[PDB]
Design an enzyme around this catalytic site. Sequence first.
Site, PDB file in Angstrom:
ATOM      1  N   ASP A  81     -15.587  30.133 -39.094  1.00  0.00           N
ATOM      2  CA  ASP A  81     -14.835  30.445 -38.670  1.00  0.00           C
ATOM      3  C   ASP A  81     -13.681  30.143 -39.798  1.00  0.00           C
ATOM      4  O   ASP A  81     -13.125  29.616 -40.791  1.00  0.00           O
ATOM      5  CB  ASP A  81     -14.976  29.263 -38.064  1.00  0.00           C
ATOM      6  CG  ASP A  81     -12.612  29.235 -36.975  1.00  0.00           C
ATOM      7  OD1 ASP A  81     -12.179  30.089 -37.233  1.00  0.00           O
ATOM      8  OD2 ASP A  81     -13.136  28.311 -36.663  1.00  0.00           O
TER       9      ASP A  81
ATOM     10  N   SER B 204      -0.372  44.144 -40.258  1.00  0.00           N
ATOM     11  CA  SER B 204      -0.737  45.323 -39.353  1.00  0.00           C
ATOM     12  C   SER B 204       0.313  46.187 -39.782  1.00  0.00           C
ATOM     13  O   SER B 204       1.566  45.593 -39.752  1.00  0.00           O
ATOM     14  CB  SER B 204      -1.706  45.532 -38.236  1.00  0.00           C
ATOM     15  OG  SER B 204      -1.803  46.393 -38.320  1.00  0.00           O
TER      16      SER B 204
END
Length: 330
Positions: free
Chosen positions: A35, A199
Site C-alpha cells: 500500500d 498530472s
Amino acid sequence: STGSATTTPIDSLDDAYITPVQIGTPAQTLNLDFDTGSSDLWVFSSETTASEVDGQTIYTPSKSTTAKLLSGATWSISYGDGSSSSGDVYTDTVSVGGLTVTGQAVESAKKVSSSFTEDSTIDGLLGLAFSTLNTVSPTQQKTFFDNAKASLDSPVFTADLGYHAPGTYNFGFIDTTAYTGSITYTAVSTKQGFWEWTSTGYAVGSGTFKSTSIDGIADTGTTLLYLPATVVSAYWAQVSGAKSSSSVGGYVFPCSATLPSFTFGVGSARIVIPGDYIDFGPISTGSSSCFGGIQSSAGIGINIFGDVALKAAFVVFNGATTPTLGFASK
C-alpha cells in the site's frame, strides 16, 4: 541487494493485490496488500480477537525465535474507506522477494474492522508511503522500504500491476525489460506523507488532450481512480446511460456498454488506461448496472491514482534524497 516478488489480484475484478511476505524465524508467509498510500506493516496475528479472524493466515510471534516485543508501542490506523485496525508491535525479520530486513516493526493486530475480517485473502498490509505517516506510538517506526533503502543497489521500488493477471514489485532495481519506451519522471511532494505528484492533464477516448494540473497520490492500496468531479463527468458523459447514483455510491453504467479509454499526462508523456480497466462489473450479482472504475474525489479531499491508473503503467517509486515518481507504458 535487491528483491522481486509477484503480486496477484485477490479476485476477478482486481479489487486489490496480495504479495507473499516472509516474517520471522522459521519464516511465516503471509499475503500482504502492498500500500503506497500508508506506512504501517500490520498483520493478522495470534493476538487478533478470534471473532474478527475468518480465514486469514496469522503471524504468531511466540513461534518466531527472532521476534521481540517492542515494549510499550501501540498502533491504530483508519483508512480512507472507513476501515481500521489497531494493536501492539514486535520487531522481527521480514523478507520480500529475497530482500531481508532485520528489526522491522511488525504491527500485530488486536482488533480489525469488519471489512478486513470479511476479506479472507488479505493477511495484512505493508505500507510503502513515507515513514512520517507511520502510526506507532510513542516511537514512530520506519517502513520496510525505508529500512531496506541503504542496502539496496538503488533506492527505488517499482510497481508493475497486472490487469486481471499477476504482476511484480521490485526493490532496488529497475527492470528495463518490463516496460516499453522511456520512463518519464515527475516531481513528488512529501508534505502530506504520500507519493504526491501533479498530472499534466487528461483525455477521454480519442478526444483531445486537456492540459490541466491534477495533484494526486500514487496509491497501490486504492482500487479505483478518483479525480475531480469535472474530469469524471467529462468521462462518463461519453458512455450512454451512465449516471452518478447516490444509492450505489458513485457512477454506474449499463453493463452492455463498451467503455472508452482514459489518458492521463505525466509531463509531456501520456499513459492510456484501456476502457476495459474501468469496468468493475455488476453492482450486485446478476445486475445489468455496472460500477465504474473512475469516480469523483469530491469529499475525499485528495485525488487518488489507484490501481485502475497504476496498472496501466510501469511505476517507479524513487526514494532518493529528493524523491520522484516515474511512469512508463508497458
